[PDB]
Amino acid sequence: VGAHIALFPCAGMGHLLPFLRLAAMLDARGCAVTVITVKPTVSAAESDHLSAFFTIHPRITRLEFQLLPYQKSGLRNDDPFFIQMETIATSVHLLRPLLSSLSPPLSAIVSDFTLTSQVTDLVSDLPISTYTLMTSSAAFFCLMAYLPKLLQIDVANRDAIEIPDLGPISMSSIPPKMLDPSDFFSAFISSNVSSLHKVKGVLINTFNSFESEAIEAVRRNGVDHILPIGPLESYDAKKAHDLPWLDEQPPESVLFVSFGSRTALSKEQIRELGAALEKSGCRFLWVLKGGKVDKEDKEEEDMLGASFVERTKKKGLIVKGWVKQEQILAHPAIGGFVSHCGWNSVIEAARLGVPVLAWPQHGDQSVNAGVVEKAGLGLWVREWGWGQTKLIGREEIAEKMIEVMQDEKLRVSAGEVRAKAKETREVDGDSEALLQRLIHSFNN
Amino acid sequence: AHIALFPCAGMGHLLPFLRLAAMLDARGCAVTVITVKPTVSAAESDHLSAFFTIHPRITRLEFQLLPYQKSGLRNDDPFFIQMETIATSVHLLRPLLSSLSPPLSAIVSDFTLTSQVTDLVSDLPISTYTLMTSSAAFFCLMAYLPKLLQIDVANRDAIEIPDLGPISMSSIPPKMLDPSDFFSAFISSNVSSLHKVKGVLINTFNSFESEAIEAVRRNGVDHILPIGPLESYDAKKAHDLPWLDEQPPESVLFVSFGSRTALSKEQIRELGAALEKSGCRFLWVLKGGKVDKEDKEEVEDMLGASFVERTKKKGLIVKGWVKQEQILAHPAIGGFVSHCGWNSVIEAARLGVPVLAWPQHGDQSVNAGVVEKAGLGLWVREWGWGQTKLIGREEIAEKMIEVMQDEKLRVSAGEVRAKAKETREVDGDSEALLQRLIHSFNN
Amino acid sequence: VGAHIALFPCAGMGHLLPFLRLAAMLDARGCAVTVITVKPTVSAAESDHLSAFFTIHPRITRLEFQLLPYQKSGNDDPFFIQMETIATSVHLLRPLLSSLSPPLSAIVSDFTLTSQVTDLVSDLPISTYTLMTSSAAFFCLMAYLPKLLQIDVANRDAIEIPDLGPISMSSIPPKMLDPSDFFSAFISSNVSSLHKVKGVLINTFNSFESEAIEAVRRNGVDHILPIGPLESYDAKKAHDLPWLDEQPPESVLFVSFGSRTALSKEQIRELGAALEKSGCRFLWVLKGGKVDKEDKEEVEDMLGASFVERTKKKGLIVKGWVKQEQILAHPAIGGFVSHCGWNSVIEAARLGVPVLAWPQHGDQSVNAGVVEKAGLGLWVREWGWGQTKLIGREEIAEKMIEVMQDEKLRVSAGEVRAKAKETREVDGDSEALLQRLIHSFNN
Amino acid sequence: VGAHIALFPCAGMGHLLPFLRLAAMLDARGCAVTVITVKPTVSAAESDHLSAFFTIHPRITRLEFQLLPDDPFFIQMETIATSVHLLRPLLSSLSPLSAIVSDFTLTSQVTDLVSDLPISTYTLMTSSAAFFCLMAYLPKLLQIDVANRDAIEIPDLGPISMSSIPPKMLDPSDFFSAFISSNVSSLHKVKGVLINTFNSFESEAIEAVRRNGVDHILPIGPLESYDAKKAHDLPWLDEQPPESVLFVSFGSRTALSKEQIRELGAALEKSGCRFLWVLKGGKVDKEDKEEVEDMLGASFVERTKKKGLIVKGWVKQEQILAHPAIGGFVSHCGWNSVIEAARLGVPVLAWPQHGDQSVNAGVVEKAGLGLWVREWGWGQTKLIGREEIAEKMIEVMQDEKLRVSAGEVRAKAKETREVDGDSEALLQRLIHSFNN
Ligand SMILES: O=c1ccn([C@@H]2O[C@H](COP(=O)(O)OP(=O)(O)O)[C@@H](O)[C@H]2O)c(=O)[nH]1
Ligand SMILES: O=c1ccn([C@@H]2O[C@H](COP(=O)(O)OP(=O)(O)O)[C@@H](O)[C@H]2O)c(=O)[nH]1
Ligand SMILES: O=c1ccn([C@@H]2O[C@H](COP(=O)(O)OP(=O)(O)O)[C@@H](O)[C@H]2O)c(=O)[nH]1
Ligand SMILES: O=c1ccn([C@@H]2O[C@H](COP(=O)(O)OP(=O)(O)O)[C@@H](O)[C@H]2O)c(=O)[nH]1
């Protein structure tokens, strides 16, 4: 553990967990690692996860930063993660005192994409080689990467968007917010992509077989230094879960439902899947988030209904809250996965080879579904659209759930992805060799 | 894009730059604000500290200016004297600006520092912009000063500025016409170097000064950009609000004469006599000591105990810094008395307060004219120059009464208030221009 | 870039734009360029254009001449009074020219003031040149007007200039044929001052006007140099064609009537009706204000709601200024409707865009004649001087449909574009002269 | 107390002490007084006096000018001129002055200053009416004669001999002439002039200045002491009988050589006068002076230890002179001191070392205030015998007429000091003139 490295996730479970994963991974490869967190955390969950991680890994060290107050309405409405990410920039300078005192000077720092522009000054005064880890799809990341020239190019939204060395992305996959220049979200991505130039390398949670077209497209696309790190290894946070029912079930019989760290859909729609879930007869494990964005704000299982919970009393079990998704997904009993297609959830399923039913709700998740379908890892119906854009059928959903359980071709293809994913983590694997090579390059 | 703001001395110069800087930061530019020490007035120093603690990501660049060194520019004013001191030392900042870790894309300089600042970034890759504290109408007079000085052989009536109504000779300040005085030398020296500036920022909206903004555009300053009204950085802890809450809406008349303007000893007693005689409710900010806040160490021994007792029911007299923008927003204030320094004037317009115009020194008279033109307030030209003139209680009181009860003004003033709102809106020109400007900054 | 060159355009977009292009051309070819402008500019557009030029082309310096008060009577034209107010202050170029660092090796002056700078080129011996913005056939008529207006001054079917196709009197403006009008005096006097010039550049080439170049060479202008077509300057933008991107190639008709408004409102509406009948997809740039950018405040009141809605999915209208050269260059544009201002005509040939000719005033009719001879466009003679006649929509529609479907025209038009390039290419005849002129200039 | 006023002395206690008294006097008369001082101060004493003054008068404000980079006192007077502009900020921030009273030496520099920040200005002269005219008539005199004559005449003033006149002042080349001549020219700007004199002391002198174009001269003499109270010092003063003690002070700077000083020290014991002697080591600098009383010799101290006391350093002169014990004064005759003697009615012996003082000695003689020997002359020029001195020294103790003449002079001084008298009247009037 001669080399000293830090990783600095900003906000959100999707951002936070992987970086921890990168750190544990880095520690495993003889790196000395500090993990930087900024408080107060947006969600109760983020700290809960963080606390365990440090307890679980003593060798890795916690490096908190306390946030200063801010009040800017320029950011549209009130979504806390952009606000949290924005606040982090306001207090980012507070970082400098913290880095100056590090015992063995940091060889490199790994920084979440959202604040790559603020850190840059910090990265010139203290000359730290700075790296980034991408939580999104390489195909989706390819879109952001080419966004600035594409945003400069036109004023209206066309039928299909062409990123230069990649298959054109349908506009339906793209978020509205991305398209309009005036909107801030556009501002945050554009500036940050520019800051990539300063960075020594860019790391993404995907592997070359997995996104062959995109990774190369990125290569000639102005993102030369991108390294396919993924799939990010398990956090090894053992353990906090009781699953007597899961053990009883036959291997690959049970269906797992998670819509991500945040809730994805309306109750009326939600009841529709529950009704369709009954029609399918799949044994299930369902994790439900009452609060669409914050764990702290949810004190609501009223939404599914009284009759349904008793009706599926022996068919399935549901958790209202947080459960270990990878711990559950590695179980022999789980054979199908219905996800919101956040890239971390999609990547974990590919690593464990669990067939996916893609049900993207917002953001980059629609683009990840296209990768899920292109990979052959999962089944996706593009026509479902964004959440609340259309109300998709109980009867319609049931046919798709029945296909995932009884389509053997998906199982053979899903099995291949697990083998493809495993091979890249083997000593001869490009992903393991790239991580090992990057660690070798870090200076004393 | 890194932008640096270089305000000169004075809360009139200081307040606008910080306000914009906060606006720039809100809209996402990396912002640095340049301050130098010492500062003439306590408020500027106290304010800067407050502003930075409220806005953490804005960098503070502090330089100690060289000791006052001079020859020429007859100056009897402390704030103007400090401006000369900042201007003579701006050329020593070239070494510091060259090595800044996040290099500046552009500098937004103060009008007074524009000539020295333009020379400073000549061989550096930094765009030079200037923010104008005053009104657009005054800028037309500034542009015409060389023509005004050359063909000004006769002391008669007013001079017709080329694209708008002629200004009375009484409105032009006598100091502006004397080349020896600092006010004239600085105005002339800066206008000559305005052509080396990428853009000139102004605190007026297109609705407020359509003729003045248009006249300057065709008069050689073709890069003018209206961004007004500037928005408050809304940072404040001390509350002096309580008396007002007791007051009925619109009853109170607010009197203030800016950061560094004081009345005559005969005028303070005649103004006080008028406030009693009028019978109006009022809020008085008393700045008897003079410009500097530190030396104005007196504490209401200007009027005496007898007067406070008589007026306590209808008035509160405060000596010290008051949160002007907040007071103006209050339901209670239905009148304002102003020296018509532009920043007060803009605030009156944004918050729709009827204004009673009372110039004491410099641009105030022209701005007073603008205020009258737009219906914002009533101006009495005959009163002429405060500090050169004395007005009796009878005259003052009647005007005070008249402004409070002009419903046409209250209706008229509101209309300006609406227009100021529109411009800030995304459609509205002033915000749009800044949004237009901000993109430009990215290079 | 050793050689020091200054070009002076007096007024009008048509005069201003070509001169800027010549300036850019000179700098690219190794001259060091000063550009002289006279303010206040008649129009907002020249100023808009000039500021962008200097910011885009920053190695070229800007020399400005502030104009003095003028008052002569006998309202003519705003660009003709500005052309005569620049000659009332043309002695103000003396101080400026004497101060210039690398002294001028040659100055290029607009033809309107060649008689007034004659004296200035003797005192400071500047080899002076002039660039003509009209056609080579219309300059021939301009260059023989003095000798034609000595004989019986009247009108015949055709008036003839020495060695070129006789020009009809229907193409010649009526004010050029009366010797007591302003026009003639300025043309006669400036053609007399062409003998003091070292060269006379025109915006054309010899394939386009073979007879005019020799007619002008064998009639008193032996030092005439055709350096056409003038190259394009930069501008940096393009949020003008979101619809242009969606439209298919060569399918869009571009309607421009020049820097200024042309036809009467009643006439325009028939074209608008005409456009509709044709089905041509179109991009239309409408200038409401017939002569002044500043004066035009009309909007949707030119064509009516009725038309704008119906063509809503098939055409777009831009009011004011558009980057005409960039638009024409676009793959989408397939036809050009022009007032046949010469500068516009040379770019259409340069860009190979087919023309429907609707000359409105002045030299435009002769230019229309040139367009016909070249094979560049379709022209109807009988349409006449603008507002002389009212042209029915049906007649307008037919020519337009004919333009869309006329294959020989495209082939001939395509052929013209190749030739224009041929001249521009380094071996090229027009290219050769400009390169040569610089070689002559002495440091 | 409405009016607000400021004083500015550049250097020497010759000017500062009077100015402060001017400052205190002005405060008494209802004036807001600000005293402007120059730093660093040339002398530790000069610095010493200022701290005491503000501390003693709480209500008098102090404003200071820090200074940017021959005689130290003269050169510094020159330095203040360099930094005069520094004054400009100070005036601008003032809580504005109804008038400023400024030192004669730097009046020329300030003229520009007064005109921009409109302030009526005055100067106060610490030298005699007879001497001021010599400065006052000097500029014409230098150009017109350019020669050396036994005596020189100022228009309405009895001519005083060259012997009195300082040599340097005579030379056109010298720095001193430029300062004096230039400043008088600047004298035109001031709305008043003040000298530490009263008409009675020099009716002839005051008139000539009035005659000679110094129409605005105002004599406000004698200036009231600004003083500390109360210190139990000089138990050696209270002990002695009235008028038994001779107090010797050659200046606010040293004036004579150790051997020349030894002759007076030997003369003092022969004279028999009881004495309190203020002995300064530094010829011109208090900080420079680091010598003990070894110029007089150990022997002198043992012999006279009961008879008299020697103070090395500074003492409060007005405080000492006012004492009953003092009956004789020996003075270098600096005017400020001479005026103090007249107001306190203490007989003087005049031994002027340098400068204006010899002329000052002449005034004392016309007055009858003290006994003077002209022949002794400029200090260190000649050696004056111990035997010769005592006879004059004894004569000062035992002359009845002198006591009478001196008694009147004190009486005359008071009358002007009182409300009816002109010096008081003008002060009242000038303040009245002062406009808020
Ligand atoms: O109950 C839950 C919900 C989510 N996750 C983890 O949350 C991470 C982030 O999910 P993703 O990136 O797919 O989407 P997000 O929640 O950020 O929208 C993934 O590692 C999931 O395994 C988990 O472990 N348990
Ligand atoms: O007691 C005061 C006096 C002034 N101001 C602020 O100072 C600003 C500038 O004053 P202005 O430019 O109107 O006058 P000036 O001080 O420049 O003469 C105004 O917006 C006021 O809000 C204040 O907050 N409290
Ligand atoms: O909307 C316009 C109109 C004109 N032009 C250009 O400006 C010049 C004006 O055209 P021209 O002089 O031929 O016509 P006129 O000036 O006589 O009306 C031409 O070079 C055009 O290329 C342009 O860029 N945009
Ligand atoms: O030991 C001393 C010597 C002098 N003085 C004061 O010195 C002042 C001015 O002295 P003067 O100008 O007469 O002499 P100079 O300064 O020119 O030597 C008088 O007010 C004295 O009271 C004093 O207080 N103590």
Strand, coil or helix: what is C383?
helix
Q: What is the CA radius of gyration of chain C?
A: 21
Tokens of A304: 């599914």
* Nearest bound ligand to the CA of residue B361: 2
Catalytic residues of D: 15, 103
Angle formed by the axes of helices D175-185 and D72-82, nearest 10°:
50
Least Cα distance to B139 among B80, B90, B204, B78 occurs for: B204
Q: Which tokens sit at A210? A: 């997995």
| Same fold: B2-233+421-441 with B241-420 | yes
DSSP string, A214-270: HHHHHHTTT-TTEEE-PSPPP---------HHHHHSPTTTEEEEE--SS--S-HHHH
Q: Is the CB of residue B380 less than 8 Å from the CB of residue B362? A: no
Contact B81 D96 (CB under 8 A): no
CATH of A3-235+421-441, one of 3.30.540.10, 3.40.50.150, 3.40.50.2000, 3.40.50.1220: 3.40.50.2000
Question: Which ligand is nearest to the Cα of residue A49, counting in written order?
Answer: 1
Tokens 């990057």 label which residue?
A438
SS (H, E, C) chain D: CCEEEEEECCCCHHHHHHHHHHHHHHHHCCEEEEEEEEECCCCHHHHHHHHHHHHHCCCCEEEEEECCCCCHHHHHHHHHHHCHHHHHHHHHHCCCCCEEEECHHHHHHHHHHHHHCCCEEEEEECCCHHHHHHHHCHHHHHHHHCCCCCEEEECCEEEEECCCCCHHHHCCCCHHHHHHHHHHHHHHCCCEEEECCCCCCCHHHHHHHHHCCCCCEEECCCCCCCCCCCCCCCHHHHCCCCCCEEEEECCCCCCCCHHHHHHHHHHHHHHCCEEEEEECCCCCCCCCCCCCCCCCCHHHHHHCCCCEEEEECCCCHHHHHHCCCEEEEEECCCHHHHHHHHHHCCCEEECCCCCCHHHHHHHHHHHCCEEECHHHCCCCCCCCCHHHHHHHHHHHHHCHHHHHHHHHHHHHHHHHHCCCCHHHHHHHHHHHHCCC
Min distance C257 CA to chain A CA atoms (Å)? 27
Q: What three-state secondary structure class fits A103?
A: coil
Q: Which positions in chain B touch C40 (Cβ < 8 Å)?
A: 162, 218-220
Phi then psi for residue D87, to 5 deg, are: -60, -30
Which of D203, D196, D204, D208 is closest to D104 using CA atoms?
Answer: D196
Q: Which residue in B24, B154, B102 sits closest to B434, CA to CA?
A: B24
| Catalytic residue of the set C4, C49, C57, C110 | C110
Nearest CA in chain B to A121: B102
Pocket of ligand 1 (CB under 6 A): A 12-14, 17, 258, 260-262, 287, 322-326, 342-345, 348
Beta carbons of B121 and B100 less than 8 angstroms apart: no
Q: Contact at 8 Å (CB) between A198 and A206?
A: no
A418's tokens: 């697990």
Kindly report the CATH number that applies to the domain delimited by B241-420: 3.40.50.2000
Is C15 catalytic? The answer is yes
Nearest to D184 by CA among D126, D148, D128, D134: D134
Name the residue with the closest Cα to ligand 2, atom 25.
B322
Task: Give me the residue spans of the domains in chain D.
Answer: 3-225+412-433, 248-411
The CA-based angle B151-B156-B158, given to 5 degrees, is 80
Kind and range of the H or E run holding B168:
strand B167-168
Superfamily of domain D3-225+412-433: Glycogen Phosphorylase B; (3.40.50.2000)
Evaluated on CA atoms B188, B190, B196, B201, the torsion sign reads negative
Beta carbons within 10 angstroms of residue D433's beta carbon = 14
Burial of B138 per CB tally in 10 Å (0-12, 13-18, 19+): buried
Q: List chain C gaps (C–N > 2.5 A) by preceding residue.
A: 74
Cα angle vertex C64, ends C61, C66, to 5°?
A: 170
From the list A56, A135, A48, A124, the residue with the least C-alpha distance to A322 is A48
φ and ψ at residue D332, rounded to 5 degrees: -70, -10
- Please report which helix (H) or strand (E) contains residue A31, including its range: strand A31-39
Rounded CA gap, B426 and B334, in Å? 29
- From the list A74, A90, A125, the residue facing B101 with the nearest CB is A125
Q: Looking at ligand 2, which atom is closest to the CA of residue B261?
A: 18
What are the DSSP E strand ranges found in A72-218?
Answer: 108-112, 129-134, 160-161, 169-170, 201-204
Which subunits sit against D, judged by 3+ Cβ pairs under 8 A? B
Return the CATH number of D248-411, one of 3.40.50.300, 3.40.50.2000, 3.40.47.10, 2.70.70.10: 3.40.50.2000
Identify the CA nearest to B4 among candidates B101, B106, B117: B106
Question: Is C in contact with D (3 or more beta carbon pairs below 8 Å)?
Answer: no
Catalogue the E-assigned strands of C233-280: 252-256
Burial of C34 (0-12, 13-18, 19+ CB in 10 A): buried
Answer whether C308's CB lies under 8 Å from C317's CB: yes
Residue with tokens 């004023």: A155
CATH number, domain C3-233+421-440:
3.40.50.2000
Q: D219, D160, D206: which is closest to D359 by C-alpha?
A: D160
For residue D40, whether the previous peptide bond is cis, meaning omega lies within 30 degrees of 0, is yes
- What token pair was written down for D14? 């010759």
Instruction: Describe the crossing of helices C210-217 and C136-148 by its angle, rounded to 10 degrees.
Output: 30
Strands, E assignment, A40-179: 61-66, 108-112, 129-134, 160-161, 169-170
Residues of A with CB under 8 A from a CB of B: 68, 71-72, 74, 89-93, 118, 120-121, 124-125, 182, 187, 191
Mutate to test the pocket of ligand 2, among B41, B344, B371 (most ligand atoms within 8 A of CB): B344
CB atoms within 10 A of CB D40: 10
Tokens of A303: 């939404």
Give the Å distances, CA to CA, from D356 to C14, C187, C194.
Answer: 86, 89, 87
Q: What is the CATH number of domain A244-420?
A: 3.40.50.2000
Beta bridge mates, C281: C252
**Minimal Cα–Cα distance from A158 to chain C, Å?**
9
Out of C47, C66, C294, whose CB is closest to B222? C47
Handedness of CA B39, B41, B45, B51 (dihedral sign): negative
H/E stretch holding B106 reads strand B106-110
CA nearest neighbour of A23 among A300, A258, A232: A232
For residue A259, give every residue at least 6 positions away whose Cβ sits within 8 Å of its Cβ, in sequence order, or none.
A265, A287, A288, A289, A339, A340, A359, A361
- Print burial letters for A195-216: b (CB count within 10 Å at least 16), e (below 16): bbeebbbbbbbbbbbbbebbbb
User: 3-class SS at C112?
Assistant: helix
For residue B10, what are its two tokens? Answer: 């004075």
Query: How many CB atoms lie under 10 A from the CB of residue D299?
Result: 8
Distance of alpha carbon D190 from alpha carbon D216, whole angstroms: 8
CB neighbours of residue C302 within 10 Å:
19
The per-type count for chain B, helices as H runs and strands as E runs, is 18, 15
**Domain B2-233+421-441 CATH class label:** alpha beta
D278 in contact with ligand 4, CB cutoff 6 A: yes
C278-to-C256, C402, C403, D419 alpha-carbon distances in Å = 17, 9, 10, 111
Instruction: Return the DSSP state at C168.
Output: E
DSSP-derived pairing of the beta strands A316-320 and A283-288:
parallel
Closest by Cα among B201, B84, B187, B83 to B144: B187
CA dist., res. A444 & res. D372, Å (int): 93
Residue from A262, C208, D92 nearest B294 by CA: D92
C67 contacts C37 by C-beta, under 8 angstroms: no
Q: How far apart are CA B366 and CA B372, in angstroms?
A: 10
- Integer Cα distance of C16 and C49 in angstroms: 9
How far is it, in rounded angstroms, from Cα C281 to Cα C265? 22
Read off φ and ψ for residue B196, nearest 5 degrees: -90, -5
- Using an 8 Å Cβ cutoff, are D95 and B290 in contact? yes
Fold of C242-420: Rossmann fold (3.40.50)
Q: If residue B281 lies in a helix (H) or strand (E), which one and from where to where? A: strand B281-285
DSSP state of B288: -
- CA D422 from centroid of its chain's CA atoms: 21
Q: Yes or no: say if A325 and A240 are a contact pair by the CB < 8 Å rule.
A: no
- Name, in order, each residue with C-beta under 8 angstroms of B180's C-beta and a sequence gap of 6 or more: B72, B73, B74
